[PDB]
Design a protein around this ligand. Structure first.
Ligand code: SAH
Lengths: 58, 72, 25, 118, 61, 235
RNA sequence: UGUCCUACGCCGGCAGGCGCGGGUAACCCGUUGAACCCCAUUCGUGAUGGGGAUCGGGGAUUGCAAUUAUUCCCCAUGAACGAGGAAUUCCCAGUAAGUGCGGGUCAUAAGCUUGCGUUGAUUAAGUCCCUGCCCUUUGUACACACCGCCCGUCGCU
């Protein structure tokens, strides 16, 4: 129950950013590979550096 | 900073307590400890010492809090 | 009625909610 | 206070922006606090600043013995760099006052933090 | 000036989370004035309240 | 629940709060750690004493880190008590008792970089009636954009309570002229969820036909691996 | 709960040994003499008589077997820890929390999971702001779709 809470909390984060984007264009101009299947947490990789998330600003 | 309360009575401290303590309108080991820079055991022992001379009136006594007052 | 609509839009609803929370011998 | 920071300082008042700089300084308590001398930072801050700002701020702070021009070099002149490092990064006016020329609002440097409130 | 006024009837719970109460409030010194106020805490009829600035009326949908 | 929800930042961070702040061992550790990642994320010229601006210095924890790295800085704070204890810690960089939302008072193009550790989440809540969250954020971001040497990055560590907070901050920054993004180091990790707004100032045909015939409601051959396969070359 | 629970006597300071009895059980442990609590003493704002980890030595017990310490006792050492930037759990009355005691797992653990009593509250009797789920209406907004731009410049074969 707390898992669905957390998951769609992140979903609402993503949707509110994606709905910020069009008025941002009008009025003006994330850990997916680092997710661990076996456990909640953040596992290091060798090809890529330590875990991060880049969401660029327009 | 760090407190430096005294463990045995100096002369000036002993004189000023013997002429100032029996009129505070509040006699308790904590308050005399904080206004005379005295560690609590010495302040306590001085308080039953002053009670032994009859200069200090006890009004209640407990294992956690013993409280006194002036005679008149 | 327009007066009723304005008054109800400017007031707060209240009342109905029943919350179920919580010897001789 | 550092002289460099106050001579890059401006006024945040809405009307005077963005030409309210520079501030007219005042001193009543001067101290010297040692600061590590990195000549790279000195040689990089030399082209950045208006030197007439140094003239006017030093004349506000009673002091005259400064170089009169941009002292550009490869960090070879130890005595100019050392003296001007003393003037900016080591001379600290602990207590003082500031007034903006275009608004008149007062800012007290009170040991040793000036005030920038509304 | 500090004013005192009796609650007459409670209108109901107001606010986003239901944290306030909108209520009918009348003065005692002049029992003619009648105002809407919103309050924090449990209220009932007969409670009397200390109003700091008694001009504006509370307003929440 | 949250220090930000308490109320006005100055009134919240009083002398009592300031004393408890420097006494907190976690505060010391987490703030120095976050300032380390901040100075790394912003790409300051390597082997160069920089000139950064501490937008939220507080006790001078992030400031002391910059002093150790050799980077001179200027502090900004709304809490008088916190600035008093920061100058009692004898930090190298200068301090200034001012409001971020009001505006940073420095010459456009003065600071090469800006360090902001846990201070911008306070600008999204109107503690007064005159206070306007959107306006306050925008004015601060516009001032920062100008004050910062056009090109230098302004790392902005924040602790968002919701998406609305982040949304407001990002819009008021992008429209003020600030470009870049946000690096959420360890995003899945919750105790290491660190949001840093880095802001520089410069056969298939046969399948479709069989589904057509299925929707039309006539008899259709069952769908197998031999649905569309060339029987032979044709001469 | 108990044919391993144990009363009682002796020895040892303590873990623990020896003997002799009761209990297949509201009969014996057991009038279950529990802990917090209450009373009195010492300590005095000091990483200290708070805090106990990690270590050195010795003794005992269960087992074929204790070494990488099974567990217990004694002496010594006194680490971090100054009420936790920040994500979040549970909860409306004998309830939360403080405090001890039992059952199952077990030749010996204490460590899980289940129950019990003792002392005993703050806030609240509301709301749909977030989350979950359920409904009703709707597919008119935004998105998808539709059209349009679909990036431009030179250079040789
Ligand atoms: N509008 C504003 N203007 C200036 N400072 C502000 C502000 N809102 C919040 N702050 C500052 O934000 C700080 C929160 S704590 C910042 C200190 C930092 N974590 C460190 O120790 O390095 C407070 O010191 C407060 O003064």
């Amino acid at each position: 129950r707390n898992k669905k809470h957390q998951k769609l909390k992140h979903q609402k984060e993503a949707e509110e950013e994606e709905l910020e984007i069009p008025p941002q264009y009008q009025a003006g101009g994330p850990g997916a590979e680092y997710k661990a299947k076996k456990a909640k947490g953040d596992v290091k990789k060798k090809g890529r550096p330590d875990p991060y998330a880049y969401i660029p600003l327009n | 900073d760090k407190l430096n309360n005294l463990v045995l009575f100096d002369k000036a401290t002993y004189d000023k307590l013997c002429k100032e303590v029996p009129n505070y309108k509040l006699i308790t080991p904590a308050v005399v400890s904080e206004r005379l820079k005295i560690r609590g055991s010495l302040a306590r022992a001085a308080l039953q010492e002053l009670l032994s001379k009859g200069l200090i009136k006890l009004v209640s006594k407990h294992r956690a809090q013993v409280i006194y007052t002036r005679n008149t | 009625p327009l007066a009723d609509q304005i008054l109800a839009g400017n007031a707060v609803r209240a009342g109905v909610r029943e919350k179920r929370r919580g010897e001789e011998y | 206070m550092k002289l460099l920071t106050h001579n890059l300082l401006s006024s945040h008042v809405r009307g005077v922006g963005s030409r309210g700089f520079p501030l007219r300084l005042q001193a009543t308590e001067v101290r010297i606090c040692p600061v590590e001398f990195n000549p790279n930072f000195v040689a990089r801050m030399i082209p950045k600043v208006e030197w007439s700002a140094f003239l006017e701020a030093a004349d506000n702070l009673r002091l005259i013995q400064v170089p009169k021009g941009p002292v550009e070099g490869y960090e070879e002149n130890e005595e100019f760099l050392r003296t001007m490092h003393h003037l900016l990064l080591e001379v600290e006016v602990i207590e003082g006052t500031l007034q903006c020329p275009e608004s008149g609002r007062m800012f007290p440097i009170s040991r040793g933090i000036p005030n920038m409130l509304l | 000036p500090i004013k005192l006024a009796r609650v007459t009837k409670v209108l109901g719970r107001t606010g986003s989370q239901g944290q306030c109460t909108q209520v009918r409030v009348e003065f005692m010194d002049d029992t003619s004035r009648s105002i809407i106020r919103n309050v924090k805490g449990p209220v009932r009829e007969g409670d009397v309240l200390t109003l700091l600035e008694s001009e504006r009326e509370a307003r929440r949908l | 629940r949250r220090p930000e929800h308490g109320g006005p930042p100055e009134l919240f961070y009083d002398e009592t709060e300031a004393r408890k702040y420097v006494r907190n061992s976690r505060m010391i550790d987490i703030q120095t750690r976050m300032a380390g990642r901040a100075l790394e994320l912003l790409y300051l010229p390597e082997n160069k004493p920089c000139y950064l601006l501490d937008i939220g210095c507080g006790t001078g924890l992030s400031g002391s880190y910059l002093s150790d790295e050799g980077h001179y800085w200027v502090g900004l704070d709304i809490s008088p008590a916190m600035l008093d204890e920061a100058v009692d810690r004898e930090i190298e960089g200068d301090l200034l008792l001012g409001d971020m939302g009001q505006g940073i008072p420095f010459k456009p193009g003065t600071f090469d970089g800006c360090i902001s550790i846990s201070a911008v989440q306070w600008l999204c809540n109107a503690n007064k009636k005159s206070e306007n969250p959107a306006k306050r954020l925008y004015c601060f971001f516009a001032s920062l954009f100008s004050v910062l040497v056009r090109g230098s990055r302004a790392v902005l560590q924040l602790y968002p309570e919701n998406s609305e907070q982040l949304e407001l901050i990002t819009t008021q920054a992008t429209k003020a002229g600030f470009s870049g993004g946000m690096v959420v180091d360890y995003p899945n990790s919750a105790k290491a969820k660190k949001f840093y707004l880095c802001l520089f100032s410069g056969r298939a045909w046969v399948l479709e036909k069989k589904e057509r015939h299925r929707r039309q409601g006539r008899e259709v051959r069952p769908d197998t691996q031999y649905t569309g396969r060339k029987r032979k070359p044709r001469f």
